[PDB]
RNA sequence: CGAUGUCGGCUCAUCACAUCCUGGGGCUGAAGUAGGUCCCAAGGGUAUGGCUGUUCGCCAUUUAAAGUGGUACGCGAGCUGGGUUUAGAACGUCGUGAGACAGUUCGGUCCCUAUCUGCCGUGGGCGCUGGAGAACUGAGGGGGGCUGCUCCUAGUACGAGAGGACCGGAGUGGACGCAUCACUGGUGUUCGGGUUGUCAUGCCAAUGGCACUGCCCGGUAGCUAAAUGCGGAAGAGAUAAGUGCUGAAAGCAUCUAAGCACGAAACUUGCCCCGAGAUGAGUUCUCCCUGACCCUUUAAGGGUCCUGAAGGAACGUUGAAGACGACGACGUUGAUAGGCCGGGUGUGUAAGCGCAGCGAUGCGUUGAGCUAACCGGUACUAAUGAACCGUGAGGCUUAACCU
RNA sequence: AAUUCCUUGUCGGGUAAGUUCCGACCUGCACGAAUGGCGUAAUGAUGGCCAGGCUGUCUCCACCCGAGACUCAGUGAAAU
RNA sequence: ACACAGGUGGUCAGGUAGAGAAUACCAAGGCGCUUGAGAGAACUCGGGUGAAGGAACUAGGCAAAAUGGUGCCGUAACUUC
């Protein structure tokens, strides 16, 4: 589901165990986030050596949710433990130097399409 | 444009090699008998009078039987006079079936809507309920957004009320043709058809360009 | 909020012009007796369908 | 509306209806005729006919029936010898419903419900 | 004339091996992966079974370390290829959704001995 | 002064235009991409949270617009009680004092079964002119009409140069309206299985009654959005601002005077639905009936008999229809309701038997047993003959033609 | 500050932002010593605040079971 | 004032579960609440079950839901001990 006040883990490195979801945005009456939908997020525990700081608000995309992704054929591919990737708002693409979990290729919009070009087997 | 009167049965899936299962609404055709052929004699117009399939007719009245005698020897379902457009539609040659869908891929389907009883407002008309919280009682789902102040004095259809809805003509234009087989007398479309199993489903090709 | 004028004796009749729950409409005939009964009901004397049942 | 509900709701709670129909269906075997209401009597066939058809199958493992559904303590000594061998063979239709109209000066649809005593 | 439960059987397979809830299936499926056709394999036990028409489905749970992946499949799919039915499982229910709540040795299914 | 309850919020829209987004025309100090910015128009469209009672003001983050306004400065026989607000009381201050502050803080009550207009749905009477059954025209009405971001059309147009766009599309998101149960989860007290307590069944196996359906878990039929599908068209007609031609009054000049064209996201027809009480009540087809007598203070009434068609309804078995009526099936020329005998989804292999076992219990017979809606067969039980309503060719005037 | 005019002060921390929370500033327009001043534990029908646990309060309602409402029948009130 | 859920002091006590005079089921004993039959509607009052998020709701965790037994372990700061 991933909605307001949701506390979840980051898929990029240096983000630490906890970040909070603070409205979906992008249109009228926007509630809940699906795989590859952009949500607004706040950083709370990030590692001192990382590019990001506490209380500075960013854009992120859902990479793990139990609603999964079904766009390719109608069969649902699902993920355990809600998680998001951190997106650059100006220069585009993800902001880390590593990525956690096995990930997915359905994240195909050109502003984050670089995710298939990383260390994962996808 | 003539309607083929397909009846409601259900939905199935049909697949492709990319694993996409392709859900499609099923309609099985029996087509028209053709039972009058009007030309010029009444108000200059041309009209076919289609008649669909066959029925048992076990208790018919003489006002119906005297018409079945001039229609043929087997009694069909419905009537539908179907007025023809000049230089656009014809009654000549062989009677037509699913060749109506050989290149036109959008359709329209008329049927009869389901009965909503009370109907109300907060389900049918997308209205908000009042909350049972903060010591609030007695009026949670009861309609009451009907005026101001004394200023309105007369009511327009943007205001919504309870009362019987359903059991009348309803038409949909959302449907896209996925597969047709003239030898299996089959029509498959993407999207859902209104009301109950059986019924009528008048079904004709789209006239929007 | 409340009644401020009494409804007329014409309005009384406009609300009593459909008051008959039973007319009462014609009866049905038996099959072994010169008797008659209510449509799809046995008489209080037991007459129905030529059976004469549960009589008193 | 009532979505898919096809059984009628009558009078009293479903728990009271359960016991009233249990008590009426078992007692009709000894009374032969009961006087009651038409809507109630039209649902009695749904429980008193399968209680008679219960004696159609013969087995030492069929005598422990009428103990979890439609209990009666006295038919279980006679019904299997009396109606099981020839009457229960017809598997239904054992009942007659007698529509009698009014009971007195009140509004209740009065009915008598009886069991057929001879098949030919 | 007559098309319900019949037309969908034209897309149904000519043979599939027989299996029940709790069985260890090992399913192989065709994938294009945004580049090139490959045969992919998925291991695990069936926690809910298919029984109805063409699009009836079954859920497979990896369970070999009590954790990891879970995925749904259809036996009449044109991209599902083959099924190993590598072991029969001993279970006493129709649904095994409680195996999504267990993750230890309590998630173990025994051999059916069919 | 015989009471139009106090501020904001939620619910709910609706009207204006000095137009916010959309369109139409234009000047730019507009070479191009952007930007600055004025006429013309009301079809379609215009944000949520923090402290705070506060809408607001401030802030955080978002827009194509979060436009400027009216609506008892739109909110109680609609709601909450926080602002406001007494009678408990305090802090600060003032007033000998009793009291006082639209200062401050805790605390402090929220009543209402509708007569009629306004409305929504729905019966019965009357009109449409012989009765009956039904399908078509269409006076007129409503619905549809908006769009962010990016990619392509296009490094093409322009311009040292950097940079970088129209038409028309697609990819991805939304408002709003509209429809489904195939997906998928949930629910599912008419289906199945497990289990705690206690009473009943002599007791035990085993099964009920009650305990939030005692508790726990699946789930058919069906609902449902937490699921899925879909949208603003061409031809023809006609329209402010604007685009105008030929041309006078006023030799020229001019869109106007005589004379005649183009055209907007708007609009009529076209599509989708309603609709002949359209008392201006239209059309056409299918079906039916070919009768008399008595009396009178009668150009009209009251009585009796022959003979009632085609059809309709009651009365039933009830449902895709339902608050009640209405209305869809079926009434033995029958599948309408119930039941039986099965199948299917669903549950999970029982109560027994055999063996093994101290025994709890396991395994085999056994994919057992059980069932409701889904699906099939069946007249097993029930829907009686009739009775009832509906009458005998259907009022008045005119024209022409054949006679 | 329950006391504060500029004041919803100023500044550090806590938020995405905080007329509120904790602390520091002194310039207390008017705290202050029984008219009581400062100070701590268990406790308290105690005002304010931070985090977690647990949750249909909410996202957004959806289905299930009764009573009153509905239908007829019985015996039959009120303001106005 | 009503065949009015209100008020009203003393006296006795049981299976099983339970620490209990709470509470579930029940025995002895008592009783079926002095209008009836149906329909299965919104709506009101009362109940039941609920996915994935979680206080975002709201002035405000108000309200509701979860927890809840016993035995054996384990036990912080603050403190007037």
UniProtKB/Swiss-Prot annotation, chain A:
Key words, A-Z:
Ribonucleoprotein, Ribosomal protein, RNA-binding, rRNA-binding
GO MF annotations for this entry?
Answer: large ribosomal subunit rRNA binding; structural constituent of ribosome
Gene (UniProt): rplN
Effect ascribed to mutating residue 97 to A:
Reduced RsfS binding
- The molecule here is called Large ribosomal subunit protein uL14
Recorded family membership:
Belongs to the universal ribosomal protein uL14 family.
Tell me one GO biological process term: cytoplasmic translation
- Origin organism is Escherichia coli (strain K12)
Q: What does this protein do?
A: Binds to 23S rRNA. Forms part of two intersubunit bridges in the 70S ribosome.
- SMART domains reported for this sequence: Ribosomal_L14 (SM01374)
Which sequence ranges form a coiled-coil region, renumbered to this chain? Answer: none
* Subunit structure as annotated in this protein's UniProt entry: Part of the 50S ribosomal subunit. Forms a cluster with proteins L3 and L19. Forms two bridges to the 30S subunit in the 70S ribosome, contacting the 16S rRNA. In pre-50S ribosomal subunits interacts with RsfS, which may inhibit association with the 30S subunit.
- A GO CC term assigned to this protein in UniProt: cytosolic large ribosomal subunit
Q: Which PANTHER family has this protein been placed in?
A: 50S/60S RIBOSOMAL PROTEIN L14/L23, LARGE RIBOSOMAL SUBUNIT PROTEIN UL14M
Curated annotation (Swiss-Prot), chain B:
Which residues are annotated with the PTM N6-succinyllysine?
38
Q: How is it modified after translation?
A: Methylated by PrmB.
Q: Does the keyword Hydrolase apply?
A: no
Protein biosynthesis as UniProt keyword: no
Q: Which Pfam families match?
A: Ribosomal_L3 (PF00297)
List, in alphabetical order, the Gene Ontology terms for molecular function in this entry: rRNA binding; structural constituent of ribosome
Checking InterPro entries in the record gives:
Ribosomal_uL3, Ribosomal_uL3_bac/org-type, Ribosomal_uL3_CS, Transl_B-barrel_sf
Report keywords, A-Z. Methylation, Ribonucleoprotein, Ribosomal protein, RNA-binding, rRNA-binding
State the protein's purpose: One of two assembly initiator proteins, it binds directly near the 3'-end of the 23S rRNA, where it nucleates assembly of the 50S subunit.
What is the official name of this protein in its record? Answer: Large ribosomal subunit protein uL3
Species assigned in the record: Escherichia coli (strain K12)
Name of the gene encoding the protein in the UniProt record? rplC
Curated annotation (Swiss-Prot), chain C:
Molecular-function annotations in GO = structural constituent of ribosome
* Ranges in coiled-coil conformation: none
Gene Ontology CC entries for this record: cytoplasm; cytosol; cytosolic large ribosomal subunit
Q: Please list where the region (Disordered) is annotated.
A: 1-37
UniProt cross-references to Pfam families, sorted A to Z: Ribosomal_L32p
Q: Which UniProt keywords apply?
A: Ribonucleoprotein, Ribosomal protein
Q: Which InterPro entries match?
A: Ribosomal_bL32 (IPR002677), Ribosomal_bL32_bact (IPR044957), Ribosomal_zn-bd (IPR011332)
Keyword Cell cycle in the entry? The reply is no
UniProt GO BP: cytoplasmic translation; response to radiation; response to reactive oxygen species; ribosomal large subunit assembly
Sequence similarity: Belongs to the bacterial ribosomal protein bL32 family.
What NCBIfam families is this protein classified in?
rpmF_bact
According to the record's subunit comment, the protein's assembly and interactions are: Part of the 50S ribosomal subunit. Contacts L17.
Name of this protein: Large ribosomal subunit protein bL32
Please give the organism. Escherichia coli (strain K12)
Curated annotation (Swiss-Prot), chain D:
- Output the Pfam families linked to this UniProt entry: Ribosomal_L17
A Gene Ontology MF term for this entry?
Answer: structural constituent of ribosome
Q: Which GO terms describe its biological process?
A: cytoplasmic translation; ribosomal large subunit assembly
What's one GO-annotated cellular component? Answer: cytosolic large ribosomal subunit
Which SUPFAM superfamilies does the record associate with it? Prokaryotic ribosomal protein L17
Q: Which domain of life is it from?
A: Bacteria
Keywords linked to the UniProt accession:
Ribonucleoprotein, Ribosomal protein
Q: Which PANTHER family match?
A: LARGE RIBOSOMAL SUBUNIT PROTEIN BL17M, RIBOSOMAL PROTEIN L17
The family note in this entry says: Belongs to the bacterial ribosomal protein bL17 family.
Complex formation:
Part of the 50S ribosomal subunit. Contacts protein L32.
**NCBIfam families recorded for this chain?**
L17 (TIGR00059)
HAMAP family linked to this entry: Ribosomal_bL17
Its biological purpose: Requires L15 for assembly into the 50S subunit.
Protein's name in the database: Large ribosomal subunit protein bL17
Output the lineage of the source organism: Bacteria, Pseudomonadati, Pseudomonadota, Gammaproteobacteria, Enterobacterales
